[PDB]
Structures are given as structure tokens and as C-alpha cells.
Coordinates of N, CA and C in Angstrom, one line a residue:
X3 N 78.8 104.6 81.4 CA 79.0 103.9 80.1 C 79.1 104.8 79.0
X4 N 78.0 105.5 78.3 CA 78.0 106.3 77.4 C 78.2 107.8 77.7
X5 N 78.0 108.1 79.1 CA 78.2 109.4 79.6 C 79.9 109.7 79.6
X6 N 80.6 108.6 79.7 CA 82.0 108.8 79.7 C 82.5 109.3 78.4
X7 N 82.1 108.9 77.2 CA 82.5 109.3 76.0 C 81.8 110.7 75.6
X8 N 80.7 111.0 76.3 CA 80.1 112.2 75.9 C 80.8 113.5 76.5
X9 N 81.7 113.3 77.5 CA 82.4 114.4 78.1 C 83.9 114.1 78.0
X10 N 84.3 113.1 77.4 CA 85.9 112.8 77.1 C 86.3 113.8 76.2
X11 N 87.2 114.7 76.5 CA 87.8 115.7 75.6 C 89.2 115.4 75.2
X12 N 89.9 114.5 75.9 CA 91.3 114.3 75.3 C 92.2 113.6 76.3
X13 N 93.4 113.9 76.6 CA 94.4 113.1 77.4 C 95.3 114.0 78.1
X14 N 95.7 113.6 79.2 CA 96.7 114.2 80.1 C 97.9 113.4 80.1
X15 N 99.0 113.7 79.5 CA 100.2 113.0 79.4 C 101.4 113.4 80.0
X16 N 102.1 112.8 80.9 CA 103.4 113.2 81.5 C 104.5 112.2 81.1
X17 N 105.3 112.5 80.1 CA 106.2 111.6 79.5 C 107.2 111.1 80.5
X18 N 107.9 112.0 81.3 CA 108.9 111.6 82.2 C 108.4 110.7 83.4
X19 N 107.0 110.7 83.5 CA 106.4 109.7 84.6 C 105.6 108.5 84.0
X20 N 105.5 108.6 82.5 CA 104.8 107.5 81.8 C 103.3 107.5 82.3
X21 N 102.8 108.6 82.4 CA 101.4 108.9 82.9 C 100.5 109.1 81.6
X22 N 99.4 108.3 81.4 CA 98.5 108.6 80.3 C 97.2 108.3 80.9
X23 N 96.5 109.4 81.1 CA 95.2 109.4 81.7 C 94.1 110.1 80.8
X24 N 92.9 109.5 80.6 CA 91.9 110.4 79.9 C 91.6 111.7 80.5
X25 N 91.1 112.6 79.8 CA 90.7 114.1 80.3 C 89.4 114.3 80.0
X26 N 88.6 114.8 81.0 CA 87.2 115.0 81.0 C 86.9 116.6 81.3
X27 N 86.0 117.2 80.5 CA 85.8 118.5 80.6 C 84.9 118.9 81.9
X28 N 84.3 118.0 82.5 CA 83.6 118.2 83.8 C 84.1 117.4 84.9
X29 N 83.6 117.8 86.1 CA 83.9 117.0 87.3 C 82.6 116.2 87.7
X30 N 82.9 115.0 88.2 CA 81.8 114.2 88.4 C 82.1 113.0 89.3
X31 N 81.2 112.3 89.9 CA 81.5 111.3 90.8 C 81.9 110.0 90.0
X32 N 81.3 109.7 88.9 CA 81.6 108.5 88.1 C 83.1 108.8 87.4
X33 N 83.8 109.8 87.5 CA 85.1 110.0 86.8 C 86.3 109.8 87.7
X34 N 86.1 109.8 89.1 CA 87.3 109.8 89.9 C 88.2 108.6 89.6
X35 N 87.5 107.6 89.2 CA 88.2 106.2 88.8 C 88.7 106.2 87.4
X36 N 88.0 107.1 86.4 CA 88.3 107.1 85.0 C 89.6 107.6 84.7
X37 N 89.6 108.9 85.0 CA 90.9 109.7 84.7 C 90.9 111.1 85.4
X38 N 91.5 112.0 84.7 CA 91.6 113.4 85.2 C 90.6 114.2 84.6
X39 N 90.2 115.3 85.3 CA 89.0 116.2 85.1 C 89.3 117.5 85.1
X40 N 88.8 118.4 84.2 CA 89.0 119.8 84.1 C 88.1 120.4 85.2
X41 N 88.8 121.2 86.1 CA 87.9 121.7 87.1 C 87.2 123.0 86.7
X42 N 85.9 123.0 87.1 CA 85.1 124.1 86.7 C 85.4 125.4 87.5
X43 N 85.2 126.5 86.8 CA 85.7 127.7 87.3 C 87.2 128.0 86.8
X44 N 87.9 127.1 86.0 CA 89.2 127.2 85.4 C 88.9 127.3 83.8
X45 N 90.1 127.6 83.2 CA 89.9 127.7 81.7 C 89.8 126.3 81.1
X46 N 88.9 126.3 80.1 CA 88.8 125.1 79.3 C 90.1 125.1 78.4
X47 N 90.7 123.9 78.3 CA 92.1 123.9 77.6 C 92.3 123.9 76.2
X48 N 92.2 125.2 75.7 CA 92.6 125.4 74.3 C 93.9 126.2 74.2
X49 N 94.4 126.7 75.3 CA 95.6 127.6 75.3 C 95.3 129.0 75.1
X50 N 96.4 129.7 75.0 CA 96.3 131.1 74.7 C 96.6 131.9 75.9
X51 N 96.7 133.3 75.8 CA 96.9 134.2 76.8 C 95.7 134.2 77.8
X52 N 96.0 134.6 79.1 CA 95.0 134.7 80.0 C 94.1 133.5 80.3
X53 N 94.8 132.4 80.1 CA 94.1 131.1 80.3 C 95.0 130.3 81.4
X54 N 94.2 129.7 82.3 CA 94.9 128.8 83.3 C 93.9 127.7 83.7
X55 N 94.3 126.7 82.8 CA 93.4 125.5 83.1 C 93.9 124.6 84.3
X56 N 93.1 124.0 85.1 CA 93.5 123.2 86.2 C 93.0 121.8 86.0
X57 N 93.7 120.9 85.7 CA 93.3 119.5 85.4 C 93.6 118.7 86.8
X58 N 92.5 118.4 87.4 CA 92.5 117.6 88.7 C 92.3 116.0 88.5
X59 N 92.8 115.4 89.4 CA 92.6 113.9 89.4 C 92.8 113.4 90.8
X60 N 92.0 112.3 91.2 CA 92.0 111.8 92.4 C 93.5 111.2 92.7
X61 N 94.0 111.4 94.0 CA 95.3 110.9 94.4 C 95.5 109.4 94.2
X62 N 94.5 108.7 94.4 CA 94.6 107.3 94.3 C 94.2 106.7 92.9
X63 N 94.0 107.6 91.8 CA 93.6 107.2 90.4 C 94.9 106.3 89.9
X64 N 94.6 105.1 89.5 CA 95.7 104.2 89.0 C 96.2 104.8 87.8
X65 N 97.6 105.2 87.7 CA 98.3 105.6 86.6 C 99.0 104.4 85.8
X66 N 99.3 103.3 86.6 CA 99.9 102.0 86.1 C 99.3 100.8 86.7
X67 N 99.0 99.9 86.0 CA 98.4 98.7 86.5 C 99.2 97.5 86.4
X68 N 99.0 96.4 87.1 CA 99.8 95.2 87.2 C 100.0 94.5 85.8
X69 N 98.9 94.3 85.2 CA 99.0 93.5 84.0 C 99.9 94.3 82.9
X70 N 99.6 95.4 82.7 CA 100.4 96.3 81.8 C 101.9 96.4 82.4
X71 N 102.0 96.5 83.5 CA 103.4 96.5 84.1 C 104.2 95.2 83.9
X72 N 103.5 94.1 84.4 CA 104.1 92.8 84.2 C 104.4 92.4 82.8
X73 N 103.6 92.9 81.8 CA 103.9 92.6 80.5 C 105.1 93.2 80.0
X74 N 105.6 94.3 80.5 CA 106.9 94.9 80.3 C 108.1 94.3 80.9
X75 N 107.9 93.1 81.6 CA 109.1 92.3 82.2 C 109.7 91.5 81.1
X76 N 110.9 91.5 81.0 CA 111.7 90.7 79.9 C 112.5 89.6 80.6
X77 N 112.9 88.7 79.9 CA 113.8 87.5 80.3 C 115.1 88.2 80.8
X78 N 115.7 87.6 81.9 CA 116.9 88.0 82.5 C 116.6 89.1 83.5
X79 N 115.5 89.8 83.4 CA 115.2 90.8 84.4 C 114.9 90.1 85.7
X80 N 115.0 90.8 86.9 CA 115.0 90.2 88.2 C 113.8 90.9 88.9
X81 N 113.1 90.0 89.7 CA 112.0 90.4 90.7 C 112.5 89.6 91.9
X82 N 111.9 90.0 93.2 CA 112.2 89.3 94.3 C 111.0 89.5 95.3
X83 N 110.9 88.5 96.1 CA 109.8 88.4 97.2 C 110.4 88.5 98.6
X84 N 110.1 89.5 99.3 CA 110.5 89.5 100.8 C 109.4 88.8 101.6
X85 N 109.8 88.0 102.2 CA 108.8 87.0 103.1 C 109.4 86.9 104.6
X86 N 108.7 87.6 105.4 CA 109.1 87.6 106.9 C 110.5 88.1 107.1
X87 N 111.1 89.0 106.2 CA 112.3 89.5 106.4 C 113.3 89.1 105.3
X88 N 113.3 87.8 105.0 CA 114.3 87.3 104.0 C 113.9 87.7 102.6
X89 N 114.8 88.2 101.8 CA 114.5 88.6 100.3 C 115.0 87.6 99.5
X90 N 114.2 87.1 98.7 CA 114.6 85.9 97.7 C 114.5 86.5 96.3
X91 N 115.8 86.5 95.7 CA 115.5 87.0 94.3 C 115.4 86.0 93.2
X92 N 114.8 86.4 92.2 CA 114.4 85.5 91.1 C 114.7 86.1 89.8
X93 N 115.2 85.5 88.7 CA 115.5 85.9 87.4 C 114.5 85.4 86.4
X94 N 113.9 86.2 85.6 CA 112.8 85.9 84.7 C 113.4 85.0 83.7
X95 N 113.0 83.7 83.4 CA 113.5 82.8 82.4 C 112.3 82.2 81.6
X96 N 111.0 82.6 81.9 CA 110.0 82.0 81.2 C 108.9 83.1 81.1
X97 N 108.3 83.4 79.9 CA 107.2 84.2 79.8 C 106.2 83.6 78.9
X98 N 105.0 83.3 79.4 CA 104.1 82.6 78.4 C 102.6 83.2 78.7
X99 N 101.9 83.4 77.7 CA 100.4 83.8 77.7 C 99.6 82.5 77.4
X100 N 98.8 82.1 78.4 CA 98.1 80.9 78.3 C 96.5 81.2 78.4
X101 N 95.7 80.2 78.2 CA 94.3 80.4 78.2 C 94.0 80.3 79.9
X102 N 93.1 80.9 80.3 CA 92.7 80.8 81.9 C 92.7 79.3 82.4
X103 N 92.5 78.4 81.7 CA 92.5 76.9 82.1 C 93.8 76.2 82.0
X104 N 94.8 76.8 81.3 CA 96.1 76.2 81.1 C 97.0 76.6 82.2
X105 N 96.8 75.9 83.2 CA 97.6 76.0 84.5 C 98.7 75.0 84.5
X106 N 98.8 74.1 83.5 CA 99.5 72.7 83.6 C 101.1 73.0 83.7
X107 N 101.5 74.2 83.0 CA 102.9 74.4 83.1 C 103.4 74.8 84.4
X108 N 102.7 75.0 85.4 CA 103.3 75.4 86.8 C 103.2 74.2 87.6
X109 N 104.4 73.7 87.9 CA 104.6 72.5 88.7 C 105.7 72.5 89.5
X110 N 105.9 71.8 90.6 CA 107.2 71.5 91.2 C 108.1 70.9 90.3
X111 N 109.1 71.6 89.9 CA 110.1 71.1 89.0 C 111.4 70.6 89.9
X112 N 111.6 69.3 90.0 CA 112.7 68.7 90.9 C 114.0 69.5 90.8
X113 N 114.6 69.8 91.9 CA 115.9 70.5 92.0 C 115.8 72.0 91.7
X114 N 114.9 72.5 91.3 CA 114.7 73.9 90.9 C 114.0 74.7 92.1
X115 N 114.4 75.9 92.2 CA 113.6 77.0 93.0 C 113.1 78.0 92.1
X116 N 111.8 77.9 92.0 CA 111.2 78.8 91.0 C 110.0 79.7 91.7
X117 N 109.8 80.8 91.0 CA 108.7 81.8 91.5 C 108.0 82.5 90.3
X118 N 106.8 82.3 90.0 CA 106.0 82.7 89.0 C 105.1 83.9 89.4
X119 N 105.3 85.1 88.7 CA 104.4 86.3 88.8 C 103.3 86.0 87.8
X120 N 102.1 85.7 88.3 CA 100.9 85.4 87.5 C 99.9 86.6 87.6
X121 N 99.4 86.9 86.5 CA 98.3 88.0 86.4 C 97.4 87.7 85.1
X122 N 96.3 88.0 85.3 CA 95.2 87.9 84.1 C 94.9 89.2 83.5
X123 N 94.5 89.2 82.3 CA 94.0 90.4 81.6 C 92.9 90.9 82.4
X124 N 92.8 92.2 82.6 CA 91.8 92.7 83.6 C 90.3 92.7 83.3
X125 N 89.9 91.5 82.5 CA 88.6 91.3 82.5 C 88.4 89.7 82.9
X126 N 87.2 89.2 82.9 CA 86.9 88.0 83.6 C 86.9 86.7 82.6
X127 N 86.1 86.9 81.5 CA 85.8 85.8 80.6 C 86.7 85.9 79.4
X128 N 87.3 84.8 79.0 CA 88.4 84.7 78.0 C 89.7 85.4 78.5
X129 N 89.9 85.4 79.9 CA 91.0 86.1 80.4 C 92.2 85.3 80.3
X130 N 93.1 85.5 79.3 CA 94.4 85.1 79.1 C 95.3 85.5 80.2
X131 N 96.1 84.4 80.7 CA 96.9 84.7 81.9 C 98.4 84.9 81.4
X132 N 99.0 85.9 82.2 CA 100.4 86.0 82.0 C 101.2 85.3 83.0
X133 N 102.1 84.5 82.5 CA 102.9 83.6 83.4 C 104.3 84.0 83.3
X134 N 104.9 84.7 84.2 CA 106.3 85.3 84.3 C 107.0 84.4 85.3
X135 N 107.8 83.4 84.9 CA 108.4 82.5 85.8 C 109.9 83.0 85.9
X136 N 110.4 82.8 87.2 CA 111.7 83.2 87.5 C 112.5 82.2 88.2
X137 N 113.8 81.9 88.0 CA 114.7 81.1 88.7 C 115.5 81.9 89.7
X138 N 115.6 81.1 90.8 CA 116.3 81.7 92.1 C 117.7 82.2 91.8
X139 N 118.0 83.5 92.2 CA 119.4 83.9 92.0 C 119.7 84.7 93.3
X140 N 121.0 84.8 93.7 CA 121.6 85.7 94.8 C 121.0 87.0 94.7
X141 N 120.6 87.6 95.9 CA 120.0 89.0 96.1 C 121.1 89.9 95.9
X142 N 121.3 90.7 94.8 CA 122.2 91.5 94.6 C 121.5 92.9 93.9
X143 N 122.3 93.8 93.4 CA 121.8 94.9 92.5 C 122.5 95.0 91.2

């Protein structure tokens, strides 16, 4: 909780991969899920000659999560669900952020073939829900 900020020294950023992770000066068990860590025995990252810092991070450390990813989806963009082989393409035509109880907008709409990618903000209470709805389109590229 407070130990995280006590050793947070900065940020590891890879622009070509859109990787933004916190950086910690120490290695610890409570940090493998938080971000990247400066390995002991290596240089502390100030730079300069005769310095070789080694920033380590768990291979499964999440660099991108679904809510932040889905929020970057725009109308007209396409997603698809493969189910038992068949790929069914859908084109985003609705994006709404609702209260966690406002599920009313999701219904069988007659004549339509719809698919909604739903996610909530990554906390539980007052968790506003992202509703990315799409209409069925042919599977192309």
C-alpha cells in the first residue's frame, strides 16, 4: 500500500509498444504485479559512463488491460467473435458508459444481429460499465 510509493522511482516507457510501467528501485514479491523493478547488483538509473542498469519485470506483467483497450475502440471499427470455428464480424455503432445497474439498453432488437463488448472500470463499487455495441457485418479485412 504505502511501501509501493516508498520505492517508486519512476517509469519504464516503450513508445513503439505503448508500454507504460512504474519503476521500482528494489526487487520484491509485492511488485511483480505492480510494474518493473531495478535489479540489485546493477546500476541505479541515473545514466553516465560505466553504468548498466537492468530493469526487470515479470513476463506476465499486464502492460495493457481490457477496459483501457476497449475504451480506445471507435465507431465503425470492427471486432469479431470466433465460436466453434465460425468467425462472426461486428461493426461498432454504439458506445455508452452507464451506471452498473443501467443494463436496460441491451435487448433483443428485432431484425438485428448485435454483439456488445461489455466491461467495467477495474473497481467494484460505482463501477461504470463500458457498452461497445456492434452490428453484424461480413468477415473481411
